Amino acid sequence: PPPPAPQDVEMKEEAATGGGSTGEADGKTAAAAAEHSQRELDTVTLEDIKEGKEPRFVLRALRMLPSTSRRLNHYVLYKALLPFLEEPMDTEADLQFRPRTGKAASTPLLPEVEAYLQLLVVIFMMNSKRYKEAQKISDDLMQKISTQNRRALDLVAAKCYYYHARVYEFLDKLDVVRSFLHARLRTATLRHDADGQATLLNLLLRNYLHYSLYDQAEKLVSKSVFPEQANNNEWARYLYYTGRIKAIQLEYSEARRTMTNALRKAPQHTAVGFKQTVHKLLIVVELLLGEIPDRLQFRQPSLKRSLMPYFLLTQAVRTGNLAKFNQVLDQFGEKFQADGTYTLIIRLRHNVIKTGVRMISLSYSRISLADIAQKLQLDSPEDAEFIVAKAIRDGVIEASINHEKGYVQSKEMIDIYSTREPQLAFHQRISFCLDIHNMSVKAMRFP
């Protein structure tokens, strides 16, 4: 009795998921597909968390005239892997429910992925996914029907793409799957579009990693439209790599804003080893800017376990002791290397001096050159003058250095009173928020 009960609830959930998708697909267009398919996908994720009986339920899913209730009785009668994957099509063709057949093909793959064999059997699941992909290829290319499969089964193809990524993660990588995704991008170029292409492209960047940054640059050129970001999590995924691309490309200032936007869009728990990686990129890039971000604002516990290094490193950046920074680099070099942001830490070792100058610029309106030398422990006043030229850098108040008695005049912007001097400054800020009044137009359109 205890082992059958999980099977009964899962089978009932799958039957409800199939019935809802099929009924909507039959009536209307656009509302026909993906109206509850995303809900069905989260229900499928719950089914993945909740666990062979599922393959027997899959067997002979459809024959001709609808007999799904009779089929459910037949699944109970079986109670009372590779062959099972192809068994329903072999036993009897559905004779209808083409969007359902792709969903039916997807249902056995999830248990095969759940098994996580990391073996040829998992590759056989990939072969079953390829057969499902062929049905997806013909959904509009050969079938002249509406894109119910493109609207819904493309998400199923995206899950299959992630399973394909799992097989490649077990091995090395498949650029050919990305090329197949490029063919899907041509399908996206057609009447209907999907943003799954960017996520696989992010994996392509990841595979090249340090060895090639061209793929990231190619990604920047590849960037197109898809501002719908219906997944939203997908937009965060695009943002996380896009921010990574800028951070490696030395555009740290743009990257931190992108990472913050990416950090905000995390509806999924991302409890362990997940959101922490997104947090890690934001903190390092802000440290690279030289502004010091304390970890107290967020401090996720899993972020904390990986943050024992960075937290000491943040203390090291505040401290003037290079040896403390060296101890942190040697002791905590591991894990940061796993993150892949270790190269950013290597550039950060030089950046420690910049943090002090930024503190000086906020603290002192007109600091003495010799005083700057004492504050940053410059060996000589001329070295401090050289540092002052570096201090002007970009995005800081004009030094306007006299080069004589004035020394580091570092004059701050004046008349910054949100008055005439900032009249553009405090009106432009309103324009952006007032521009967000678009939400009233967008939601009004939905009814």
Partner: protein, 257 residues
């Protein structure tokens, strides 16, 4: 087989004509096979391994003659051989130093984003060893610090690291970005930084860099009477321009209705 290309290795290239003959024979190698159309036929790729060695020495000849467009083609081709999956490819002593030479070359063409891309390109080489790779990475730390302050240290860091032609290019790529500052009479001497362009307090050699095109780069006001810099400033007359901006934004808020 394919001699002369590997035949002149002992006599590298005292004559530039020998490099031209080598290019023609390399073109004949291209006639025999493309650089790497596919990863199939690894034996043909083994022939390409011999080609990599001749290209690596050929790139050194390009630096010896200070070629730029031909060197760019050869450097891209050498990178493509590294691009080739060729797992069979053996470790090459020429390859490690030349990738470091390429890193220095990126500084010479001022491709700063690429220079970090190259530091990324060999993470295992950078680790701690590969002293040839280390000199440009140390130079990169100096470059963000301002190559001018440590340029004397960088010049004397290695008398010969196979970068002898490349260090001459490094002297050529001496940074003059410090030019946007007061100088001549107002500052009079910038030799304290130690960059070659502003090096020397007042002699004709310093004057040649200092008074090149009248003043260093030569655009903008003369440094001696320069007002610190361009000194463009800003005005509140823009309110009329802002009024024009106001027409566009305000009309749109009404346009939405």
């Amino acid at each position: 087989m394919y001699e002369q290309l590997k035949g002149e290795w002992n006599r590298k290239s005292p004559n530039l004509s020998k490099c031209g003959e080598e290019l023609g024979r390399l073109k004949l190698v291209l006639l025999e096979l493309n650089f790497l159309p596919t990863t199939g036929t690894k034996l043909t790729k083994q022939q390409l391994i011999l080609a990599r060695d001749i290209l690596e020495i050929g790139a050194q000849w390009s630096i010896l003659r200070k070629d730029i467009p031909s060197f760019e083609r050869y450097m891209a081709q050498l990178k493509c051989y590294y691009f080739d999956y060729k797992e069979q490819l053996p470790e090459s002593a020429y390859m490690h130093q030349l990738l470091g030479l390429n890193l220095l070359f990126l500084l010479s063409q001022n491709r700063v984003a690429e220079f970090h891309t190259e530091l990324e390109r060999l993470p295992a080489k950078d680790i701690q060893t590969n002293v040839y790779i280390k000199h440009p990475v140390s130079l990169e730390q100096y470059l963000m610090e301002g190559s001018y302050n440590k340029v004397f240290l960088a010049k004397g860091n290695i008398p010969a690291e196979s970068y002898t032609f490349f260090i001459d290019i490094l002297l050529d790529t001496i940074r003059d970005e410090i030019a946007g500052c007061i100088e001549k009479a107002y500052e009079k001497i910038l030799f304290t930084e130690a960059t070659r362009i502003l090096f020397f307090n007042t002699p004709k050699k310093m004057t040649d860099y200092a008074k090149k095109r009248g003043w260093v780069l030569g655009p903008n006001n003369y440094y001696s009477f320069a007002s610190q810099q361009q000194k463009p400033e800003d005005t509140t007359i823009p309110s009329t321009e802002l009024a024009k901006q106001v027409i566009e934004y305000a009309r749109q808020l009404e346009m939405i209705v």
